[PDB]
Ligand SMILES: O=C(O)[C@@H]1O[C@@H](O)[C@H](OS(=O)(=O)O)[C@@H](O)[C@@H]1O[C@H]1O[C@H](COS(=O)(=O)O)[C@@H](O[C@@H]2O[C@@H](C(=O)O)[C@@H](O[C@H]3O[C@H](COS(=O)(=O)O)[C@@H](O[C@@H]4O[C@@H](C(=O)O)[C@@H](O[C@H]5O[C@H](COS(=O)(=O)O)[C@@H](O)[C@H](O)[C@H]5NS(=O)(=O)O)[C@H](O)[C@H]4OS(=O)(=O)O)[C@H](O)[C@H]3NS(=O)(=O)O)[C@H](O)[C@H]2OS(=O)(=O)O)[C@H](O)[C@H]1NS(=O)(=O)O
Ligand SMILES: O=C(O)C1=C[C@H](O)[C@@H](OS(=O)(=O)O)[C@H](O[C@H]2[C@H](O)[C@@H](NS(=O)(=O)O)[C@@H](O[C@H]3[C@H](O)[C@@H](OS(=O)(=O)O)[C@H](O[C@H]4[C@H](O)[C@@H](NS(=O)(=O)O)[C@@H](O[C@H]5[C@H](O)[C@@H](OS(=O)(=O)O)[C@H](O)O[C@H]5C(=O)O)O[C@@H]4COS(=O)(=O)O)O[C@H]3C(=O)O)O[C@@H]2COS(=O)(=O)O)O1
């Protein structure tokens with residue numbers, strides 16, 4: 208139904224919950240199809256027990272070929288599900304750090320500027336960037352772990368992306384000079400953010 | 411410590427909980443190695459940016475080589491972890507159905523057999539065989555989802571494995587038929603269950 212497809216998943220359901228549920232639904236559906244084909248294969252096999260060799264091989268080629276078309280569907284579906292999910296996760300992570308940066312800039316320009324609000328907004332921005340850094344490392348680590356050939360294709364891009372994040376954080380930290388008197392009041396807490404709480408981009 | 415390795419995990423930790431914990435330990439461990447190398451790479455990169463391309467290209471290949479060794483180690487380690495875990499799940503499923511068969515044979519052979527006991531045992535048994543069947547299909551649907559050539563090669567084994575389960579179930583139900591009055595009695599419940 209087109210209207211349902213327009214509305215999409217409810218707001219209650221997170222991307223992660225919806226992903227798992229769709230993965231699970233395909234998995235059940237595909238287990239049923241595979242099981243039916245396997246049963247037919249078995250049933251043809253039971254009648255043909257004493258068949259001549261080449262007749263038995265033809266019976267096997269018949270079902271192997273059905274299974275192949277099935278396997279390729281299963282994997283095509285999977286790619287589509289996994290690409291849609293990966294694209295959404297990246298967008299969410301991009302949104303979280305950009306909205307947090309927004310919060311930080313709004314707090315800096317407040318009048319009278321409020322140290323606690325600025326500090327809080329900065330903690331939230333630094334976490335969001337760290338979430339992107341960990342996602343970049345973990346996805347690389349995961350592809351290395353289950354698909355080592357795909358991993359070699361990524362290295363340089365991963366390497367570049369981490370430098371990008373690191374510079375951007377430092378350029379953002381630099382925006383504290385927008386309110387240098389708030390900068391000075393916050394100096395010890397900033398050392399604490401970056402190194403005690405380990406929110407710094409080079410931790 | 412060898413003695414700790416002998417004892418293995420505590421009994422209160424399931425194989426599943428244990429497996430996820432170990433996978434996550436290794437994951438956090440390997441992300442740090444990779445971050446360490448990536449940062450070394452960035453510093454060498456930066457330090458040598460004004461140098462000749464021959465000096466620079468020789469540098470890139472150096473860390474690429476380093477990471478390739480790292481990818482290999484990560485991949486192999488995940489293989490050993492997945493092998494250990496698959497081997498243990500198959501043993502658990504084996505043990506549950508064999509233990510359940512034992513119960514069904516005992517109750518069946520009791521003097522005299524009692525329909526409530528048999529039928530509880532037969533139910534526990536069937537569930538156990540259904541569990542191995544689900545596992546066999548799900549594993550295969552998963553290799554199909556992820557690795558095409560490996561699915562092509564296990565295809566016939568899975569077929570064979572499913573037939574074996576089916577033959578065991580039929581044989582076990584046929585033992586019930588040895589007692590026609592007990593078989594006919596439980597059969598309505600069984601047929602409900604067998605197609606449940
Ligand atoms: O023994 C008893 O407990 C009791 O026995 C009697 O007293 C009673 O029975 S009776 O009345 O006498 O007949 C009864 O009270 C009880 O038995 C029955 O109830 C219990 C309790 O459940 S319930 O509350 O009633 O619902 C049942 O046991 C509990 O639930 C099962 C269950 O599967 O539902 C188990 O749940 C956990 O463990 C399983 C298996 O363990 S393990 O093999 O992993 O070590 C987990 O499934 C596996 O992992 C998932 C997974 O990771 O997602 C799946 O893996 C595949 O998919 C993933 C992708 O997913 S994801 O994106 O990563 O999330 C992929 O990465 C994997 O590679 C892929 N594997 S595959 O392709 O090779 O297949 C698969 O489902 C499993 O993978 S596998 O290892 O390869 O097979 C499951 O996820 C996990 N659930 S949990 O929520 O995370 O905890 C537990 O055994 C148990 O949980 S509990 O908390 O300890 O209670 C019992 O089954 C039932 N017996 S029965 O009804 O008679 O049959
Ligand atoms: O390689 C594949 O293509 C692949 C696809 C399939 O999904 C699956 O195949 S199958 O199962 O074999 O069939 C495999 O999935 C991989 C997955 O691709 C990979 N992602 S990665 O980016 O390459 O590293 C990895 O996934 C784990 C990641 O940590 C993360 O993925 S992410 O979507 O890219 O970010 C995601 O993390 C989930 C948490 O698991 C979830 N926690 S839960 O408790 O609610 O279940 C939640 O965490 C929140 C939450 O608010 C709270 O967590 S809690 O622990 O305290 O409860 C905390 O605040 O942290 C939050 C958070 O971490 O964000 O959501 C996150 C992220 O949300 S998101 O999914 O929307 O992005 O999933 C992890 C996971 O283990 O699933 O590993 C997968 C499986 O590992 S594998 O089997 O070894 O390959 O392969």
Ligand SMILES: [Zn+2]
Nearest residue numbers: 398401402407
């Ligand atoms: Zn510092």
